[PDB]
mmCIF file of C-alpha atoms in Angstrom:
data_model
loop_
_atom_site.group_PDB
_atom_site.id
_atom_site.type_symbol
_atom_site.label_atom_id
_atom_site.label_comp_id
_atom_site.label_asym_id
_atom_site.label_seq_id
_atom_site.Cartn_x
_atom_site.Cartn_y
_atom_site.Cartn_z
ATOM 1 C CA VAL A 1 -15.878 -32.539 6.250
ATOM 2 C CA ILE A 2 -17.931 -29.763 5.664
ATOM 3 C CA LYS A 3 -21.702 -30.910 4.884
ATOM 4 C CA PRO A 4 -24.462 -29.086 2.852
ATOM 5 C CA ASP A 5 -26.664 -28.508 6.332
ATOM 6 C CA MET A 6 -24.948 -28.384 9.653
ATOM 7 C CA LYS A 7 -26.582 -27.038 12.567
ATOM 8 C CA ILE A 8 -25.664 -24.520 15.402
ATOM 9 C CA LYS A 9 -25.997 -24.821 18.928
ATOM 10 C CA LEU A 10 -24.614 -21.758 21.038
ATOM 11 C CA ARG A 11 -24.462 -20.007 24.725
ATOM 12 C CA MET A 12 -23.396 -16.359 25.326
ATOM 13 C CA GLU A 13 -22.297 -14.935 28.607
ATOM 14 C CA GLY A 14 -22.369 -10.942 28.852
ATOM 15 C CA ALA A 15 -23.195 -7.620 30.482
ATOM 16 C CA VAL A 16 -23.604 -4.392 29.064
ATOM 17 C CA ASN A 17 -23.450 -1.246 30.808
ATOM 18 C CA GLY A 18 -23.474 -3.275 34.078
ATOM 19 C CA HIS A 19 -26.271 -4.986 33.356
ATOM 20 C CA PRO A 20 -25.299 -8.945 33.095
ATOM 21 C CA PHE A 21 -27.317 -11.537 31.067
ATOM 22 C CA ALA A 22 -27.229 -15.118 29.391
ATOM 23 C CA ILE A 23 -28.301 -16.021 25.999
ATOM 24 C CA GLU A 24 -28.533 -19.617 24.409
ATOM 25 C CA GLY A 25 -29.499 -20.490 20.853
ATOM 26 C CA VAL A 26 -30.132 -22.945 18.445
ATOM 27 C CA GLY A 27 -30.005 -22.720 14.622
ATOM 28 C CA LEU A 28 -28.965 -24.247 11.072
ATOM 29 C CA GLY A 29 -27.356 -22.908 8.169
ATOM 30 C CA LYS A 30 -25.858 -24.073 4.574
ATOM 31 C CA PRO A 31 -22.218 -23.621 4.691
ATOM 32 C CA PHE A 32 -21.461 -23.449 0.952
ATOM 33 C CA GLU A 33 -24.315 -21.382 0.483
ATOM 34 C CA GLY A 34 -23.507 -18.431 3.005
ATOM 35 C CA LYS A 35 -27.223 -18.986 4.596
ATOM 36 C CA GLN A 36 -28.399 -19.248 8.493
ATOM 37 C CA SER A 37 -30.738 -19.017 10.698
ATOM 38 C CA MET A 38 -31.153 -19.788 14.390
ATOM 39 C CA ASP A 39 -33.460 -19.191 17.436
ATOM 40 C CA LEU A 40 -32.158 -17.297 20.568
ATOM 41 C CA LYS A 41 -33.977 -16.968 23.696
ATOM 42 C CA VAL A 42 -32.918 -15.025 27.025
ATOM 43 C CA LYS A 43 -31.711 -17.156 29.850
ATOM 44 C CA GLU A 44 -30.437 -14.965 32.255
ATOM 45 C CA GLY A 45 -31.142 -10.886 32.758
ATOM 46 C CA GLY A 46 -34.335 -10.681 30.946
ATOM 47 C CA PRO A 47 -35.638 -8.322 29.741
ATOM 48 C CA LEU A 48 -32.676 -6.545 28.307
ATOM 49 C CA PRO A 49 -32.633 -2.935 28.713
ATOM 50 C CA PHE A 50 -30.710 -2.594 25.694
ATOM 51 C CA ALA A 51 -30.738 -2.581 21.790
ATOM 52 C CA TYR A 52 -30.613 -6.391 20.916
ATOM 53 C CA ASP A 53 -28.846 -5.044 17.489
ATOM 54 C CA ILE A 54 -25.896 -4.627 19.440
ATOM 55 C CA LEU A 55 -25.558 -8.562 20.067
ATOM 56 C CA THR A 56 -26.716 -10.051 16.953
ATOM 57 C CA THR A 57 -23.605 -9.699 15.089
ATOM 58 C CA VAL A 58 -21.786 -12.035 17.460
ATOM 59 C CA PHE A 59 -24.539 -14.580 17.144
ATOM 60 C CA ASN A 60 -18.994 -17.780 12.323
ATOM 61 C CA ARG A 61 -17.788 -17.134 8.684
ATOM 62 C CA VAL A 62 -17.971 -20.842 7.928
ATOM 63 C CA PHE A 63 -21.352 -19.457 6.817
ATOM 64 C CA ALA A 64 -20.564 -17.575 3.884
ATOM 65 C CA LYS A 65 -20.400 -18.443 0.100
ATOM 66 C CA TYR A 66 -16.796 -18.934 -1.127
ATOM 67 C CA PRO A 67 -16.240 -18.680 -4.799
ATOM 68 C CA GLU A 68 -13.422 -21.819 -5.812
ATOM 69 C CA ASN A 69 -11.012 -18.947 -7.211
ATOM 70 C CA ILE A 70 -10.540 -17.938 -2.957
ATOM 71 C CA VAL A 71 -9.157 -19.801 0.108
ATOM 72 C CA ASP A 72 -11.598 -20.752 2.560
ATOM 73 C CA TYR A 73 -9.813 -19.579 6.013
ATOM 74 C CA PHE A 74 -12.761 -20.884 8.082
ATOM 75 C CA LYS A 75 -13.931 -24.178 6.365
ATOM 76 C CA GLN A 76 -9.999 -25.196 6.229
ATOM 77 C CA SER A 77 -10.032 -25.068 9.507
ATOM 78 C CA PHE A 78 -12.111 -27.721 10.553
ATOM 79 C CA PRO A 79 -12.955 -30.240 12.583
ATOM 80 C CA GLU A 80 -10.706 -28.748 14.861
ATOM 81 C CA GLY A 81 -11.816 -25.448 14.381
ATOM 82 C CA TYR A 82 -11.065 -21.536 15.137
ATOM 83 C CA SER A 83 -11.955 -18.907 17.118
ATOM 84 C CA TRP A 84 -12.004 -15.250 16.758
ATOM 85 C CA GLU A 85 -11.859 -11.582 18.772
ATOM 86 C CA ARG A 86 -13.505 -8.399 17.928
ATOM 87 C CA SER A 87 -14.122 -5.062 19.156
ATOM 88 C CA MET A 88 -16.862 -3.056 18.533
ATOM 89 C CA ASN A 89 -16.725 0.792 18.882
ATOM 90 C CA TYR A 90 -19.790 2.860 18.596
ATOM 91 C CA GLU A 91 -19.497 6.779 17.541
ATOM 92 C CA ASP A 92 -21.150 7.996 20.504
ATOM 93 C CA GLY A 93 -18.567 6.340 22.766
ATOM 94 C CA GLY A 94 -19.447 3.052 23.248
ATOM 95 C CA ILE A 95 -17.501 -0.209 23.108
ATOM 96 C CA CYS A 96 -18.386 -3.732 22.589
ATOM 97 C CA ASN A 97 -16.014 -6.517 22.466
ATOM 98 C CA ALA A 98 -16.533 -10.321 22.341
ATOM 99 C CA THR A 99 -14.644 -13.811 21.672
ATOM 100 C CA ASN A 100 -16.662 -16.898 20.143
ATOM 101 C CA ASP A 101 -14.517 -20.110 20.223
ATOM 102 C CA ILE A 102 -15.876 -22.451 17.403
ATOM 103 C CA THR A 103 -15.464 -26.350 17.757
ATOM 104 C CA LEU A 104 -17.491 -29.027 15.564
ATOM 105 C CA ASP A 105 -19.520 -31.897 17.310
ATOM 106 C CA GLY A 106 -20.292 -34.325 14.454
ATOM 107 C CA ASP A 107 -22.754 -31.682 12.402
ATOM 108 C CA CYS A 108 -23.240 -29.367 14.624
ATOM 109 C CA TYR A 109 -20.865 -26.265 15.158
ATOM 110 C CA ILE A 110 -20.863 -25.213 18.786
ATOM 111 C CA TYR A 111 -20.093 -21.401 20.214
ATOM 112 C CA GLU A 112 -19.265 -20.674 23.709
ATOM 113 C CA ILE A 113 -19.264 -16.678 23.473
ATOM 114 C CA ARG A 114 -18.476 -13.999 25.911
ATOM 115 C CA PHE A 115 -19.725 -10.170 25.686
ATOM 116 C CA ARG A 116 -18.831 -6.800 27.243
ATOM 117 C CA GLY A 117 -20.522 -3.776 26.284
ATOM 118 C CA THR A 118 -19.651 -0.495 27.885
ATOM 119 C CA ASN A 119 -19.677 3.182 28.267
ATOM 120 C CA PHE A 120 -22.985 3.534 26.319
ATOM 121 C CA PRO A 121 -24.662 6.928 26.948
ATOM 122 C CA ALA A 122 -27.858 6.301 28.959
ATOM 123 C CA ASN A 123 -29.903 8.504 26.807
ATOM 124 C CA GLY A 124 -28.378 6.424 23.899
ATOM 125 C CA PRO A 125 -29.789 4.777 20.823
ATOM 126 C CA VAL A 126 -28.699 1.559 22.719
ATOM 127 C CA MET A 127 -29.886 2.097 25.890
ATOM 128 C CA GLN A 128 -32.700 3.089 25.209
ATOM 129 C CA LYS A 129 -33.144 0.743 22.360
ATOM 130 C CA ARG A 130 -34.016 2.878 19.258
ATOM 131 C CA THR A 131 -31.958 0.536 16.976
ATOM 132 C CA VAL A 132 -34.127 -0.913 13.937
ATOM 133 C CA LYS A 133 -31.329 -3.209 11.985
ATOM 134 C CA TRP A 134 -27.735 -3.463 10.799
ATOM 135 C CA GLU A 135 -27.304 -1.943 7.174
ATOM 136 C CA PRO A 136 -25.845 -4.552 4.762
ATOM 137 C CA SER A 137 -22.071 -4.340 4.781
ATOM 138 C CA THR A 138 -19.245 -5.426 3.083
ATOM 139 C CA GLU A 139 -16.494 -6.908 5.824
ATOM 140 C CA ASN A 140 -12.474 -6.500 4.559
ATOM 141 C CA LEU A 141 -10.492 -9.481 4.957
ATOM 142 C CA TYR A 142 -6.742 -9.272 4.753
ATOM 143 C CA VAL A 143 -3.751 -11.333 6.642
ATOM 144 C CA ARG A 144 -1.526 -10.192 9.520
ATOM 145 C CA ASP A 145 0.520 -11.790 11.675
ATOM 146 C CA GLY A 146 0.046 -15.064 10.320
ATOM 147 C CA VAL A 147 -3.795 -15.063 11.033
ATOM 148 C CA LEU A 148 -6.708 -13.602 9.390
ATOM 149 C CA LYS A 149 -8.194 -9.810 10.438
ATOM 150 C CA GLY A 150 -11.788 -8.476 9.439
ATOM 151 C CA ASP A 151 -12.446 -5.112 9.149
ATOM 152 C CA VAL A 152 -15.776 -3.555 8.647
ATOM 153 C CA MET A 153 -17.614 -0.078 8.866
ATOM 154 C CA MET A 154 -21.225 -0.830 9.783
ATOM 155 C CA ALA A 155 -24.255 1.188 10.682
ATOM 156 C CA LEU A 156 -27.564 0.416 12.758
ATOM 157 C CA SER A 157 -30.331 2.519 11.161
ATOM 158 C CA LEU A 158 -32.702 3.978 13.873
ATOM 159 C CA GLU A 159 -36.037 5.629 14.504
ATOM 160 C CA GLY A 160 -36.464 8.730 12.529
ATOM 161 C CA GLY A 161 -34.312 7.339 9.790
ATOM 162 C CA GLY A 162 -30.478 7.836 10.663
ATOM 163 C CA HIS A 163 -27.654 5.935 11.376
ATOM 164 C CA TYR A 164 -25.555 4.658 14.153
ATOM 165 C CA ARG A 165 -22.217 4.168 12.954
ATOM 166 C CA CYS A 166 -19.547 1.549 14.431
ATOM 167 C CA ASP A 167 -16.547 0.288 13.317
ATOM 168 C CA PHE A 168 -15.937 -3.635 13.719
ATOM 169 C CA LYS A 169 -12.026 -4.813 14.081
ATOM 170 C CA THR A 170 -12.255 -8.931 13.872
ATOM 171 C CA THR A 171 -9.120 -11.108 14.512
ATOM 172 C CA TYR A 172 -9.813 -15.007 13.182
ATOM 173 C CA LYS A 173 -7.340 -17.523 14.701
ATOM 174 C CA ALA A 174 -7.195 -21.009 12.964
ATOM 175 C CA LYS A 175 -6.298 -23.870 15.730
ATOM 176 C CA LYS A 176 -4.527 -25.629 12.963
ATOM 177 C CA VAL A 177 -2.270 -24.374 10.451
ATOM 178 C CA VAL A 178 -4.622 -23.691 7.531
ATOM 179 C CA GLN A 179 -3.754 -22.123 4.034
ATOM 180 C CA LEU A 180 -4.024 -18.476 3.878
ATOM 181 C CA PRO A 181 -5.889 -16.201 1.712
ATOM 182 C CA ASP A 182 -5.119 -13.319 -0.106
ATOM 183 C CA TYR A 183 -7.232 -10.001 0.341
ATOM 184 C CA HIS A 184 -10.744 -9.754 0.092
ATOM 185 C CA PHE A 185 -14.261 -9.070 0.941
ATOM 186 C CA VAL A 186 -17.631 -10.619 2.561
ATOM 187 C CA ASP A 187 -21.061 -8.842 2.120
ATOM 188 C CA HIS A 188 -23.270 -9.613 5.130
ATOM 189 C CA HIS A 189 -26.646 -9.094 5.611
ATOM 190 C CA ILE A 190 -28.034 -9.640 8.876
ATOM 191 C CA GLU A 191 -31.569 -9.180 9.727
ATOM 192 C CA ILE A 192 -34.070 -10.243 13.069
ATOM 193 C CA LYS A 193 -36.720 -11.840 10.967
ATOM 194 C CA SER A 194 -39.082 -11.924 14.340
ATOM 195 C CA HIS A 195 -39.011 -11.691 17.807
ATOM 196 C CA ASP A 196 -41.501 -11.710 20.761
ATOM 197 C CA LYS A 197 -41.910 -8.646 22.814
ATOM 198 C CA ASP A 198 -38.847 -7.951 24.958
ATOM 199 C CA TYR A 199 -36.753 -9.763 22.578
ATOM 200 C CA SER A 200 -36.460 -12.755 24.829
ATOM 201 C CA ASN A 201 -37.078 -14.973 21.837
ATOM 202 C CA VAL A 202 -35.481 -14.103 18.639
ATOM 203 C CA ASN A 203 -35.227 -15.565 15.553
ATOM 204 C CA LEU A 204 -32.156 -14.246 13.158
ATOM 205 C CA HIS A 205 -30.913 -14.853 9.877
ATOM 206 C CA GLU A 206 -27.832 -13.647 8.009
ATOM 207 C CA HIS A 207 -26.776 -14.409 4.414
ATOM 208 C CA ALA A 208 -23.018 -13.912 3.427
ATOM 209 C CA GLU A 209 -21.121 -14.190 0.112
ATOM 210 C CA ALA A 210 -17.405 -13.587 -0.254
ATOM 211 C CA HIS A 211 -15.557 -12.249 -3.400
ATOM 212 C CA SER A 212 -13.105 -10.523 -5.280
ATOM 213 C CA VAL B 1 -26.817 18.680 -17.555
ATOM 214 C CA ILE B 2 -24.443 15.608 -17.222
ATOM 215 C CA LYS B 3 -23.224 14.524 -20.552
ATOM 216 C CA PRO B 4 -21.665 10.796 -21.578
ATOM 217 C CA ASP B 5 -18.201 11.804 -21.586
ATOM 218 C CA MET B 6 -17.233 14.558 -19.821
ATOM 219 C CA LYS B 7 -13.464 15.757 -18.972
ATOM 220 C CA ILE B 8 -11.261 16.917 -15.968
ATOM 221 C CA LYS B 9 -9.007 19.423 -15.330
ATOM 222 C CA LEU B 10 -7.313 19.773 -11.661
ATOM 223 C CA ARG B 11 -5.007 21.242 -9.529
ATOM 224 C CA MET B 12 -3.907 19.899 -6.177
ATOM 225 C CA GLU B 13 -1.540 22.221 -3.667
ATOM 226 C CA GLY B 14 -0.230 20.272 -0.901
ATOM 227 C CA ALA B 15 2.293 18.696 1.571
ATOM 228 C CA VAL B 16 3.357 15.725 3.228
ATOM 229 C CA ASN B 17 5.546 15.633 6.331
ATOM 230 C CA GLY B 18 6.895 18.850 5.548
ATOM 231 C CA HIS B 19 7.652 18.592 2.103
ATOM 232 C CA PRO B 20 5.408 20.790 0.129
ATOM 233 C CA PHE B 21 4.468 20.344 -3.822
ATOM 234 C CA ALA B 22 1.926 21.036 -6.433
ATOM 235 C CA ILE B 23 0.318 18.605 -9.282
ATOM 236 C CA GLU B 24 -2.269 19.527 -11.961
ATOM 237 C CA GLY B 25 -4.246 16.980 -14.122
ATOM 238 C CA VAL B 26 -6.307 17.144 -17.240
ATOM 239 C CA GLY B 27 -8.469 13.659 -17.896
ATOM 240 C CA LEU B 28 -11.546 12.517 -18.242
ATOM 241 C CA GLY B 29 -14.469 9.730 -17.695
ATOM 242 C CA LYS B 30 -18.074 8.705 -18.236
ATOM 243 C CA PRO B 31 -19.962 9.635 -15.292
ATOM 244 C CA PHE B 32 -22.886 7.058 -16.418
ATOM 245 C CA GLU B 33 -20.639 4.227 -16.431
ATOM 246 C CA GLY B 34 -18.358 5.064 -13.297
ATOM 247 C CA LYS B 35 -15.197 5.086 -15.116
ATOM 248 C CA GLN B 36 -12.387 7.527 -15.540
ATOM 249 C CA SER B 37 -8.683 8.248 -16.650
ATOM 250 C CA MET B 38 -6.474 11.330 -16.330
ATOM 251 C CA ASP B 39 -3.097 12.500 -16.602
ATOM 252 C CA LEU B 40 -1.145 13.959 -14.003
ATOM 253 C CA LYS B 41 2.250 15.641 -13.835
ATOM 254 C CA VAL B 42 4.081 17.296 -10.877
ATOM 255 C CA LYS B 43 4.821 21.019 -11.249
ATOM 256 C CA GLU B 44 6.290 21.723 -7.968
ATOM 257 C CA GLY B 45 7.925 19.770 -5.245
ATOM 258 C CA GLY B 46 9.156 17.135 -7.891
ATOM 259 C CA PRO B 47 10.638 14.378 -7.088
ATOM 260 C CA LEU B 48 8.013 13.277 -4.386
ATOM 261 C CA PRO B 49 9.952 11.317 -1.373
ATOM 262 C CA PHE B 50 6.510 9.597 -0.035
ATOM 263 C CA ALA B 51 4.121 7.111 -1.647
ATOM 264 C CA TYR B 52 2.564 8.162 -4.393
ATOM 265 C CA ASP B 53 -0.518 6.442 -3.716
ATOM 266 C CA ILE B 54 -1.906 8.335 -0.666
ATOM 267 C CA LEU B 55 -2.958 10.818 -3.095
ATOM 268 C CA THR B 56 -4.234 9.222 -5.987
ATOM 269 C CA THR B 57 -7.680 8.494 -4.341
ATOM 270 C CA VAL B 58 -7.747 12.433 -3.839
ATOM 271 C CA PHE B 59 -7.624 12.918 -7.587
ATOM 272 C CA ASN B 60 -15.586 13.461 -7.557
ATOM 273 C CA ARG B 61 -18.255 10.400 -6.867
ATOM 274 C CA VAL B 62 -19.920 12.172 -10.250
ATOM 275 C CA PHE B 63 -17.811 9.675 -11.943
ATOM 276 C CA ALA B 64 -20.123 6.445 -10.273
ATOM 277 C CA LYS B 65 -22.801 4.081 -12.059
ATOM 278 C CA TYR B 66 -25.745 4.863 -10.062
ATOM 279 C CA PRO B 67 -28.621 2.429 -10.619
ATOM 280 C CA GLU B 68 -32.216 4.084 -11.504
ATOM 281 C CA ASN B 69 -33.722 2.949 -7.839
ATOM 282 C CA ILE B 70 -30.994 4.860 -5.763
ATOM 283 C CA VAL B 71 -30.707 9.051 -5.348
ATOM 284 C CA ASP B 72 -27.621 10.119 -7.206
ATOM 285 C CA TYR B 73 -26.640 12.926 -4.995
ATOM 286 C CA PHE B 74 -23.129 14.258 -6.716
ATOM 287 C CA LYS B 75 -25.062 14.548 -10.397
ATOM 288 C CA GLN B 76 -27.932 16.554 -8.811
ATOM 289 C CA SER B 77 -25.766 19.007 -7.518
ATOM 290 C CA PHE B 78 -25.068 20.473 -10.728
ATOM 291 C CA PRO B 79 -23.988 22.788 -12.681
ATOM 292 C CA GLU B 80 -23.520 24.363 -9.458
ATOM 293 C CA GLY B 81 -21.453 21.790 -8.065
ATOM 294 C CA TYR B 82 -20.553 20.092 -4.487
ATOM 295 C CA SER B 83 -17.398 19.870 -2.307
ATOM 296 C CA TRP B 84 -15.791 17.634 0.161
ATOM 297 C CA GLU B 85 -13.615 17.338 2.972
ATOM 298 C CA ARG B 86 -11.873 13.841 4.292
ATOM 299 C CA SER B 87 -9.755 12.686 7.177
ATOM 300 C CA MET B 88 -7.522 9.949 6.070
ATOM 301 C CA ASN B 89 -6.158 7.405 9.056
ATOM 302 C CA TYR B 90 -3.134 5.695 8.494
ATOM 303 C CA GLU B 91 -2.681 2.595 10.921
ATOM 304 C CA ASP B 92 0.679 3.388 11.734
ATOM 305 C CA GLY B 93 -0.497 7.130 12.735
ATOM 306 C CA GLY B 94 0.042 9.071 9.518
ATOM 307 C CA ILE B 95 -2.991 11.060 8.800
ATOM 308 C CA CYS B 96 -3.900 13.216 5.704
ATOM 309 C CA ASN B 97 -6.463 15.685 5.147
ATOM 310 C CA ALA B 98 -7.640 16.644 1.818
ATOM 311 C CA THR B 99 -10.598 19.192 0.100
ATOM 312 C CA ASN B 100 -11.862 19.384 -3.216
ATOM 313 C CA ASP B 101 -13.908 22.119 -4.501
ATOM 314 C CA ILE B 102 -15.735 20.825 -7.813
ATOM 315 C CA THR B 103 -17.187 23.278 -10.695
ATOM 316 C CA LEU B 104 -18.543 23.001 -13.903
ATOM 317 C CA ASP B 105 -16.976 24.706 -16.659
ATOM 318 C CA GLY B 106 -18.914 23.578 -19.854
ATOM 319 C CA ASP B 107 -18.039 20.030 -20.015
ATOM 320 C CA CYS B 108 -15.163 19.812 -18.369
ATOM 321 C CA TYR B 109 -15.280 19.307 -14.402
ATOM 322 C CA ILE B 110 -12.800 21.169 -12.288
ATOM 323 C CA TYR B 111 -11.073 20.209 -9.135
ATOM 324 C CA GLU B 112 -9.898 22.677 -6.785
ATOM 325 C CA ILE B 113 -7.861 20.451 -3.970
ATOM 326 C CA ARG B 114 -5.839 21.231 -0.883
ATOM 327 C CA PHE B 115 -3.645 18.304 0.522
ATOM 328 C CA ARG B 116 -1.858 17.846 3.972
ATOM 329 C CA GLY B 117 -0.325 14.654 4.967
ATOM 330 C CA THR B 118 2.252 14.499 8.543
ATOM 331 C CA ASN B 119 2.735 12.354 11.131
ATOM 332 C CA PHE B 120 3.963 9.646 8.879
ATOM 333 C CA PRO B 121 6.990 7.540 10.406
ATOM 334 C CA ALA B 122 10.529 7.857 8.724
ATOM 335 C CA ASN B 123 10.712 4.298 8.010
ATOM 336 C CA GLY B 124 7.210 3.914 7.007
ATOM 337 C CA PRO B 125 6.041 2.266 4.057
ATOM 338 C CA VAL B 126 4.387 5.862 2.668
ATOM 339 C CA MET B 127 8.102 7.525 2.947
ATOM 340 C CA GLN B 128 9.901 4.633 1.962
ATOM 341 C CA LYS B 129 7.906 4.474 -1.074
ATOM 342 C CA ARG B 130 6.905 0.541 -0.320
ATOM 343 C CA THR B 131 3.149 0.753 -1.291
ATOM 344 C CA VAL B 132 1.964 -0.999 -4.580
ATOM 345 C CA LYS B 133 -1.583 -0.159 -4.920
ATOM 346 C CA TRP B 134 -4.840 0.296 -3.489
ATOM 347 C CA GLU B 135 -6.946 -2.929 -2.895
ATOM 348 C CA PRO B 136 -10.605 -2.516 -4.031
ATOM 349 C CA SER B 137 -13.170 -1.030 -1.697
ATOM 350 C CA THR B 138 -16.806 -0.385 -0.530
ATOM 351 C CA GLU B 139 -17.559 2.841 0.390
ATOM 352 C CA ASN B 140 -20.250 3.153 2.987
ATOM 353 C CA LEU B 141 -22.726 6.101 2.170
ATOM 354 C CA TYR B 142 -25.451 7.808 4.463
ATOM 355 C CA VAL B 143 -26.898 10.947 5.542
ATOM 356 C CA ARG B 144 -26.134 12.533 8.219
ATOM 357 C CA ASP B 145 -26.816 16.441 9.383
ATOM 358 C CA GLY B 146 -28.250 17.495 5.969
ATOM 359 C CA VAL B 147 -25.304 16.417 4.256
ATOM 360 C CA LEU B 148 -23.714 13.270 2.659
ATOM 361 C CA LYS B 149 -21.358 11.476 5.091
ATOM 362 C CA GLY B 150 -18.742 8.699 3.180
ATOM 363 C CA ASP B 151 -17.033 5.951 5.345
ATOM 364 C CA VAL B 152 -14.481 3.464 3.890
ATOM 365 C CA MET B 153 -11.866 0.937 5.218
ATOM 366 C CA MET B 154 -8.759 0.929 2.478
ATOM 367 C CA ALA B 155 -6.029 -0.928 2.458
ATOM 368 C CA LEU B 156 -2.633 -0.530 0.741
ATOM 369 C CA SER B 157 -1.001 -3.516 -0.486
ATOM 370 C CA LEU B 158 2.993 -3.703 0.300
ATOM 371 C CA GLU B 159 6.303 -4.801 -0.681
ATOM 372 C CA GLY B 160 5.759 -8.631 0.252
ATOM 373 C CA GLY B 161 2.242 -9.026 0.587
ATOM 374 C CA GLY B 162 0.905 -7.776 3.579
ATOM 375 C CA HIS B 163 -1.460 -4.563 3.944
ATOM 376 C CA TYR B 164 -1.207 -1.029 5.319
ATOM 377 C CA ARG B 165 -4.656 -0.026 6.659
ATOM 378 C CA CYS B 166 -6.242 3.369 6.480
ATOM 379 C CA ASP B 167 -9.983 4.465 7.488
ATOM 380 C CA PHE B 168 -11.254 7.158 4.975
ATOM 381 C CA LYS B 169 -14.010 9.358 6.509
ATOM 382 C CA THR B 170 -15.710 11.921 3.869
ATOM 383 C CA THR B 171 -18.393 14.424 3.894
ATOM 384 C CA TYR B 172 -20.081 15.624 0.759
ATOM 385 C CA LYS B 173 -21.274 19.231 0.674
ATOM 386 C CA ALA B 174 -23.740 19.814 -2.537
ATOM 387 C CA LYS B 175 -23.908 23.850 -2.800
ATOM 388 C CA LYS B 176 -27.439 24.109 -4.146
ATOM 389 C CA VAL B 177 -30.374 22.085 -1.920
ATOM 390 C CA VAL B 178 -30.755 18.668 -3.674
ATOM 391 C CA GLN B 179 -32.307 15.113 -3.075
ATOM 392 C CA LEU B 180 -30.508 12.803 -0.451
ATOM 393 C CA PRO B 181 -30.175 8.931 -0.389
ATOM 394 C CA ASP B 182 -30.645 6.534 1.528
ATOM 395 C CA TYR B 183 -27.939 4.142 2.765
ATOM 396 C CA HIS B 184 -26.027 2.643 -0.151
ATOM 397 C CA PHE B 185 -22.584 1.270 -1.165
ATOM 398 C CA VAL B 186 -20.140 2.663 -3.772
ATOM 399 C CA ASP B 187 -17.495 0.146 -4.993
ATOM 400 C CA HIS B 188 -14.262 1.271 -5.697
ATOM 401 C CA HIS B 189 -11.132 0.114 -7.907
ATOM 402 C CA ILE B 190 -7.984 2.341 -8.166
ATOM 403 C CA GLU B 191 -5.470 1.703 -10.650
ATOM 404 C CA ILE B 192 -2.033 4.015 -11.532
ATOM 405 C CA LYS B 193 -2.184 2.371 -15.108
ATOM 406 C CA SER B 194 1.278 3.586 -16.040
ATOM 407 C CA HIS B 195 3.730 6.476 -15.025
ATOM 408 C CA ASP B 196 7.544 7.347 -15.191
ATOM 409 C CA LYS B 197 10.195 6.622 -12.704
ATOM 410 C CA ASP B 198 9.544 9.003 -10.270
ATOM 411 C CA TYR B 199 5.757 9.413 -10.878
ATOM 412 C CA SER B 200 5.874 12.889 -12.417
ATOM 413 C CA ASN B 201 3.871 11.976 -14.652
ATOM 414 C CA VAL B 202 1.373 9.343 -14.048
ATOM 415 C CA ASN B 203 -1.910 7.844 -15.808
ATOM 416 C CA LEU B 204 -4.939 6.523 -13.050
ATOM 417 C CA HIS B 205 -8.023 4.960 -13.606
ATOM 418 C CA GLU B 206 -10.525 4.431 -11.255
ATOM 419 C CA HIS B 207 -14.148 2.767 -11.840
ATOM 420 C CA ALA B 208 -17.077 2.842 -9.364
ATOM 421 C CA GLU B 209 -20.399 1.406 -9.206
ATOM 422 C CA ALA B 210 -23.181 2.271 -6.654
ATOM 423 C CA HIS B 211 -25.526 -0.290 -5.495
ATOM 424 C CA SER B 212 -27.739 -1.660 -2.589
#
């Protein structure tokens, strides 16, 4: 029931280092081509006093190009959907955790999202908005305990060159019971194409292709 | 001074969970094509009572295909060479550490290697030789503190399907002073093409291509 063009609707409630915030978002993409884009406005918490970049990767692996020879765990899970939970460890001690429950409403995906970030040093790159972008990545996906795990080593580039390392660990739980895939990879590039002064409005893209 | 075909000569002294061992090895490869193969015989410690797989990734990123648009940190470092140090953390608590100093002797690379593994549960996949192979990987390389770091998430497949997760963290120190590269990746596939009953003799291949 996956369609060539589908839309996205999402809200995130969160808090980073004690500062609460709420973001909502609208966008669309092509599930079979692995491309997507979305617009995101801050509803509460504005202006955010931390790097927006830490949030962007939380903003649905259904939007990945999956070759025929690989089982699409995500596209199979619909219309019932699936959820995922992710830990995010930054080398300077900051931790972020996030869940997203994903449901289908016609042709438009709905994300319910929760986000908690903490232990970011005050003088760190996240608290001082010194991040620039996520470098591209390759996520490693493998089956464990009947669900689907996703691990990836991430790096934010910083002001002056230089990189800020984060490790993502993700678990994907399909609602219904779906066919499980062998070990494979998903390349990612995520970009903020544009934004206003304090990232209250943000336009975000990500293309992703699975392979072996 | 890098040549189309070059040879490898290597010795490793080590110990895993208290059991000492020594391995030597001869092989060759094509630096510019990222392919290599080697033969490895156990000299002391035979037969090894642990998974051979934990060793194989220690057995020279000069053997990677580097496109023109990317700085080859390794190929630049010669004939003086370079060394590297790697931590290897397995999810079941076992840790391995390893260094390799790499020198050129004519057309043949020489590896001096040290290896320490410990804290592997007795009933674990490494102590019970239940590993099958390393899944392919994508290593993320970035510059830090004037040297070159290399991080990669690895998985050993196991008996019965299922996977054993390890995180590699590697630092590469060139001897001389060489040009430093931007963030990039190196895909790896490493295979034991053949071996005798107890892995005393082993034939090992790895192809690797850098990209962006």
